[PDB]
Amino acid sequence: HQDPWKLSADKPDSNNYYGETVANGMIGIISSPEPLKVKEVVLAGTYDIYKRGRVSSFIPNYNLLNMKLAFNGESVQTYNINNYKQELDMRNGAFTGSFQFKDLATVTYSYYALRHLPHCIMMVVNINTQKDTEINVENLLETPSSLNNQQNYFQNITNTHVNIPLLTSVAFTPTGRSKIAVSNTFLFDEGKKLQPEILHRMNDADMHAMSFDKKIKAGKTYSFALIGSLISSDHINDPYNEAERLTIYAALEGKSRLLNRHMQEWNSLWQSDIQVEGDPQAQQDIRSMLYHLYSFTRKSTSLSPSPMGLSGLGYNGHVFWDTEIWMFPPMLLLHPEIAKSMIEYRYQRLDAARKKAAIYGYDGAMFPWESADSGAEETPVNALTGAFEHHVTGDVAIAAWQYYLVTGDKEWLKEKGWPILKATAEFWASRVEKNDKGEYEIKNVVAADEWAENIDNNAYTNGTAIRNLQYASKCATVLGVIAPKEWTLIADKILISKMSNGVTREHDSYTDQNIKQADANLLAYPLKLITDKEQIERDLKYYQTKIPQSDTPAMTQAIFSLLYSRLEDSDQAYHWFKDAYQPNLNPPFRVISECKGGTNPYFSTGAGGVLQAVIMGFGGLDIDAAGGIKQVKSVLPKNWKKLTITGIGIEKKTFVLTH
Amino acid sequence: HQDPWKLSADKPDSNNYYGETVANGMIGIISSPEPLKVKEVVLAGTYDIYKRGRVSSFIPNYNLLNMKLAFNGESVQTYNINNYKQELDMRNGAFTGSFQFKDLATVTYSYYALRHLPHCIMMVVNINTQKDTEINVENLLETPSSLNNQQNYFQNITNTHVNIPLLTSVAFTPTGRSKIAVSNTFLFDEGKKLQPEILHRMNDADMHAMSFDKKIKAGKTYSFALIGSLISSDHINDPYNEAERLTIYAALEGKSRLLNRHMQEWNSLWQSDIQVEGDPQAQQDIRSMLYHLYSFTRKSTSLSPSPMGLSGLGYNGHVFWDTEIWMFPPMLLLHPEIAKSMIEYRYQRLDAARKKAAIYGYDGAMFPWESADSGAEETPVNALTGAFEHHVTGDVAIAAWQYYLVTGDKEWLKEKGWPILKATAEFWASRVEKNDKGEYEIKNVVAADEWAENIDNNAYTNGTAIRNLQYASKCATVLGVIAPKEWTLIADKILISKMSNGVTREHDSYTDQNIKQADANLLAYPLKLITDKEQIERDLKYYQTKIPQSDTPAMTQAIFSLLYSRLEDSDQAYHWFKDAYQPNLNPPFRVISECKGGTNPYFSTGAGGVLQAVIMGFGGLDIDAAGGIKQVKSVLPKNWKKLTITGIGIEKKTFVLTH
């Protein structure tokens, strides 16, 4: 179970099973332990009021691949199959199930969230019979309880060459905000004259199905595909017609052309890769982390991932600083075009951030703690983070400036980076309060350590304000535009306090409280406001035991690992690397939960942080303040013989590290 | 019946009658054989799901001019009038009916889609008595079956000088997408104190009416006008109040000022004209073609015509390459501001084209096969053209570049042309596939010859991709930008293949199939990729007999005519000119149907192609690759003594051709 490209599960156990995801940045499909079923389907960009939080949410969508297979009238059941296995191929995001039905036949099924077609899915089914048999195949479109006012359609699209039978459903999100359309077809090898007749049943209010029978003779393979398209009014004004049009398009492209394009785009993604010699379990784990970030993002878009990407409804699908600080940096180094989509999300929501600032009495752009379709605040009102956790505005500015440092794209800086940096700096200039001593305070926030609520001069928040004001001033200089001199005057005098032991104080009321997650240590990395190695170490020594084992998210130990790598402490760096994610794993595919012993995978945020510990920590790679990627001193884990990182920066550099 | 400015019908025969249209580019009114009625009214820019195709459509609207006239209680009908005539004056788009009622009176009515007021219509009624009579006049607002949830209102707008009685209806398109308002008034010469009292009746669910009586002594003229405004929520947020405001405005402007402004704008349109000496029928036919293009377009807008303009619901009012390649070129030469509106339509919809490209797995802008309000794909899903007929993207690029070549407007090129040319070139660069020989293919399209479906390397499609990439590269140079070198490398190696006889092969599976319409011949004109006169002729010889007589649209023979004019073959040029439209005519006004012997006028696309045969063929006028309009060698039909074309290019040049 240490294949560097594949995650395998023998005999899935429904009593202890956390499904894996295939996704193309638009649709996520989460696996079921049951053969020929999927557990959950999530469509990006589609939000409505639904369950948690009384705010916008991702919606469970049509389980569009659900299929029933029968041999001579006997349905495939977990109790009448053997040699049942599931495999995720991380090289192409293929999820494959395989089993033997009694003594009769072997079945394999592989499904894909097509990498080049954001709204299209395909499953290919192969049946090898040891005896003459007849299969009955049914594809079910069950309207999930999350949707309402469904309609169930079926028709034949014909010409002299084809009969494309379309199984289509159209339904609405809870408040009617979004119309969803799904359209499925069966694609056969044998041609219009020889293909099986497709029957349509509409027996339930919330389910219809299409079906066929096929005779297969002993020693023969029969293979067919199910193609589906899933799209909403958030993506296209006419999703009903666009879903049918897409499935017709995909059917006439054919299985070979679809899979070739899918494979080409996955091959391109894996040109940026991390290779570890001496630790096959670490190699597999790091490939899973890259696989999830690549699956949960999309170049050449304005999409940004939620903390759980497309693995489910984690945090309602909202966008947080989890993108800017946790998932964005590794993607900026490996695939700047993915980072460009993440910051495009924020650029296209700058007007909503300006509206939030004005509603809360500030200038400029105040990005929300949680973002969804509009870019307005989406945080549940019972969570004080929505009203008071203000560092997200500085986190967006830091990612925008980093995008420019790595790419050197001055046209992007003029058109998109500067609008963001100028407006966010204007926010901080309005948010600070000057005291009698001439110092600038940021009073009454929720800290990055969210257990500290309604406190003053949070280390991380104040640091993000300092960096936002400095980076906006630097940006103005690059573009030849005059910045307010007040931005530098404020940045230079924002309070960062030390306790009597010389340790950075997390906030004005802080002595020795347990903390939820890294806060003061974030001034060392990522902010690099603390560079003195003795100060980095004294802050690590004080705070590293302040994070409890229980109910603390994977947004801490990866930073500890990275800082200890930068201090050239191999034992502590590797200790914190393992602690960052191994206590958070779920079987049978080692998906990552938010907290230690948690059961809510997949926490993409956690993977992003650990990828920083590998690339920026063990690899020593750094976003240079002057521009480009540089390498600083680092150490490898004792047991790692070689670390190779490919596709880094706009020059696509390879870095090799050894002992 | 060969008046060069007027189309006349004596005794309209309802068993064999195709109405003529008056339009201002916003409202079209199609004539009825019945006196004082109209058959159909169409409003541009208003689309909803309705009948054909299960996609957006134009909607039949209020027949707002419908009137009932009675003389001494006797209802005027087809059956009890004599000397009944209808006439379209193409000089000012006036449709006039005239008849005698027994021994009592002569009636004339003229209606207009006011050229300067997009949402306003007027009809003027004149009654000239031979005996004492009393008239009853009723104007009916019948909600058509295409609309729902109507409300029927009536009120008096008064001051010391006027009583403006308003007959208003408000209703909704089938899905509720669009609110329509119509508001009518009667305008009287005699003033407030003496004008007839207006009654209002609401006797039906779907009809209300306003009416009056008037005594007219023998040997007197009594005239009045009906003014109506028709507008939707697609045009204005509050159509109900805007319709009443417009009708009040028009009533207080008055008939003389309205008709004077109408006349001035029509006079300006006819400053660009085509005069033929020696063929009165050709002179009238070509005037009708110009009249329809002028009626179905509007300068200073983002409107683009459907293949049937505002003559009805042909092709659901969708915009196709029928604009860019067929109606756009003659308008660009005669009235560049009309062509500007046509390409503005596409510029405004560039973001929807980018969204289509991303949904179908391509880069840049992929214009839809059929466009309506949003710019998303609107093609019925059972038509494979929507998914696979890709040349439309190159057709939009070619029109954008031609607009710049004719006008030399570098400001327009920077703001609008280049956005289009850059995005459409990015699409083609992503659409091609390089083969082992280093050639570029465009695989699996529907050809311009739409009878060839899901074939490879269509001649016309590949030619449009070549031109799009070349023109985008030239555009970059005008603006001092370095185009991606890949655009030229791809353009120079896109496959255009010949068969063994040296004839341009229509597609990779083509031998000798019948074809729907011009495809390979379009490489000679309009693309001018084929300039060698022997190659042009070889291609004409092979393909000219491949277009069947039946069910083939008017998108072929005008090209044949133009190419034979350019080859200086007068007999063949004139043969194909006549064949292009004379077999497609419908009585009694010689309107043009789509196909030979068809009954679906008015096919504005057909008129556009024929006008190119006249201007670019017989007139030899050509868009110079280096900029401006040039004249190449041409011939006239034997029987044409002189061809005069006025208002050509930004210099408004007159060209005279003789034998």
Ligand SMILES: OC[C@H]1O[C@@H](O)[C@H](O)[C@@H](O)[C@@H]1O
């Ligand atoms: O249907 C898709 C297929 O279309 C054919 O016309 C092309 O030659 C194939 O390469 C392509 O895979």
Ligand SMILES: OC[C@H]1O[C@@H](O)[C@H](O)[C@@H](O)[C@@H]1O
């Ligand atoms: O992952 C979403 C959020 O989860 C919370 O547990 C953390 O305290 C936040 O920093 C994070 O943004």
Ligand SMILES: OC[C@H]1O[C@@H](O)[C@H](O)[C@@H](O)[C@@H]1O
């Ligand atoms: O979604 C509401 C809140 O949930 C809490 O569990 C997280 O710690 C906050 O970051 C979040 O804003």
Ligand SMILES: OC[C@H]1O[C@@H](O)[C@H](O)[C@@H](O)[C@@H]1O
């Ligand atoms: O420690 C986990 C807890 O952290 C708090 O910051 C959040 O507000 C809670 O929603 C969460 O359950």
Ligand SMILES: OC[C@H]1O[C@@H](O)[C@H](O)[C@@H](O)[C@@H]1O
């Ligand atoms: O109502 C329109 C009329 O208004 C008068 O005030 C003007 O003198 C006329 O020129 C005009 O035609």
Ligand SMILES: OC[C@H]1O[C@@H](O)[C@H](O)[C@@H](O)[C@@H]1O
């Ligand atoms: O006029 C609309 C469409 O009609 C079809 O008959 C032709 O094949 C197309 O070229 C044309 O765009």
Ligand SMILES: OC[C@H]1O[C@@H](O)[C@H](O)[C@@H](O)[C@@H]1O
């Ligand atoms: O409107 C659907 C289709 O109708 C067909 O008759 C035309 O040939 C196509 O160009 C069009 O896309």
Ligand SMILES: OC[C@H]1O[C@@H](O)[C@H](O)[C@@H](O)[C@@H]1O
């Ligand atoms: O020849 C006319 C036929 O041409 C085909 O290309 C279209 O798809 C049909 O809708 C049309 O009736």
